[PDB]
Amino acid sequence: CCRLACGLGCHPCC
């Protein structure tokens, strides 16, 4: 999971 990069096709965010 990604925190800030979660918006780059990486969800859900942690």
CA 3 to chain centre: 5
Counting Cα atoms < 13 Å in the Cβ hemisphere of 7 gives 1
Give exposure, 1-14, as e/b (b: 16+ Cβ within 10 Å): eeeeeeeeeeeeee
Three-state DSSP state, 11: coil
Experimental method: NMR
Three-state DSSP state, 6: helix
